[PDB]
Design a protein around this ligand. Structure first.
Ligand SMILES: *[C@@H]1O[C@H](CO)[C@@H](O[C@@H]2O[C@H](CO)[C@@H](O[C@@H]3O[C@H](CO[C@H]4O[C@H](CO)[C@@H](O)[C@H](O)[C@@H]4O)[C@@H](O)[C@H](O[C@H]4O[C@H](CO)[C@@H](O)[C@H](O)[C@@H]4O)[C@@H]3O)[C@H](O)[C@H]2NC(C)=O)[C@H](O)[C@H]1NC(C)=O
Ligand SMILES: *[C@@H]1O[C@H](CO[C@@H]2O[C@@H](C)[C@@H](O)[C@@H](O)[C@@H]2O)[C@@H](O[C@@H]2O[C@H](CO)[C@@H](O)[C@H](O)[C@H]2NC(C)=O)[C@H](O)[C@H]1NC(C)=O
Ligand SMILES: *[C@@H]1O[C@H](CO)[C@@H](O[C@@H]2O[C@H](CO)[C@@H](O)[C@H](O)[C@H]2NC(C)=O)[C@H](O)[C@H]1NC(C)=O
Ligand SMILES: *[C@@H]1O[C@H](CO)[C@@H](O[C@@H]2O[C@H](CO)[C@@H](O)[C@H](O)[C@H]2NC(C)=O)[C@H](O)[C@H]1NC(C)=O
Length: 168
């Protein structure tokens, strides 16, 4: 009885804007029939990878993938947004000691400057930043709510806060 399958998204963002694409893939079970469940309803998709093109809020929700008589995977919650700024996260629940990366993602990959992430109101400093993202080794301290800010065109926006937990 091979252990249970696992879903991975490419990109890793489980929070995406309306109109973006994301691919879901069911994990490695053997070297060597797929069944996708969207919000718990068997999908007409049977291939190993589920492609979500031009995301629609309707695509938000839970997802599971299962091989025949091998118990289903752990649920993955996707969520489509519509806003100027969106704080994307590698994962919302991180196992202490693992990597945590964030991303102040602008709509249509718009140029955002003066970016600044914050953990519980306070700015986070010294994360490995790169216009693309910021990373850090997970700590039980890193737990808390996040949200970034940045200037677009000439204005300063702020994203919807986000709740991240580092299970010690
Ligand atoms: C699987 O199950 C999940 C639940 O976990 C469902 O997810 C919900 O899906 C609905 C849409 O079906 C989402 O609600 C929609 O929100 C839109 C925008 O949200 C508001 O907030 C943002 C952020 O502040 C604003 O940008 C935005 O303007 C809104 O203020 C609404 O626009 C939608 O209704 C309106 O727009 C649509 C399309 O334009 C019109 O058709 C409507 O008439 C109306 O004018 C809608 O309310 C909800 O947020 C989702 N929940 C979560 C947590 O993501 C999945 O949809 C479901 N999928 C299936 C197939 O079962
Ligand atoms: C991420 O951090 C963990 C734990 O780091 C500890 O706390 C830091 C502040 C610093 O004081 C470190 O020296 C501490 O060890 C790293 O540790 C690994 O943790 C796993 C279990 O959690 C353990 O089995 C490994 O043996 C640990 N390895 C080491 C070198 O201690 C973890 O490796 C770090 N990951 C990266 C790449 O940063
Ligand atoms: C999401 O992926 C789709 C393809 O799956 C992209 O849509 C293509 O867009 C080009 C022009 O931009 C068209 O010529 C193609 O016909 C489209 N493909 C399909 C299958 O319709 C889309 O651009 C991607 N969106 C993002 C945000 O990258
Ligand atoms: C994000 O995390 C914060 C803090 O961990 C949560 O807010 C706290 O909620 C408790 C009650 O559950 C309040 O007594 C505290 O005052 C709140 N703290 C702050 C700083 O506001 C919040 O619930 C989490 N967000 C979500 C959606 O779970």
């Amino acid at each position: 009885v091979p252990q249970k399958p696992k879903v991975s998204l490419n990109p890793p963002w489980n929070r995406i804007f309306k109109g973006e694409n994301v691919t879901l893939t069911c994990n490695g079970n053997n070297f060597f029939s797929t069944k996708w469940f969207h919000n718990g309803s068997l999908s007409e998709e049977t291939n190993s990878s589920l492609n979500i093109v031009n995301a629609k809020f309707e695509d938000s929700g839970e997802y599971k993938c299962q091989h025949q008589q091998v118990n289903e995977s752990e649920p993955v919650y996707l969520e489509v947004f519509s806003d100027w700024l969106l704080l994307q996260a590698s994962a919302e629940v991180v196992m202490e000691g693992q990597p945590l990366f964030l991303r102040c993602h602008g709509w249509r990959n718009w140029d955002v400057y003066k970016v600044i992430y914050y953990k519980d109101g306070e700015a986070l400093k010294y994360w490995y930043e790169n216009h693309n993202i910021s990373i850090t080794n997970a700590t039980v301290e890193d737990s808390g709510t996040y949200y970034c800010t940045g200037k677009v065109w000439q204005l300063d926006y702020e994203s919807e806060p986000l709740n991240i937990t580092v299970c010690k």
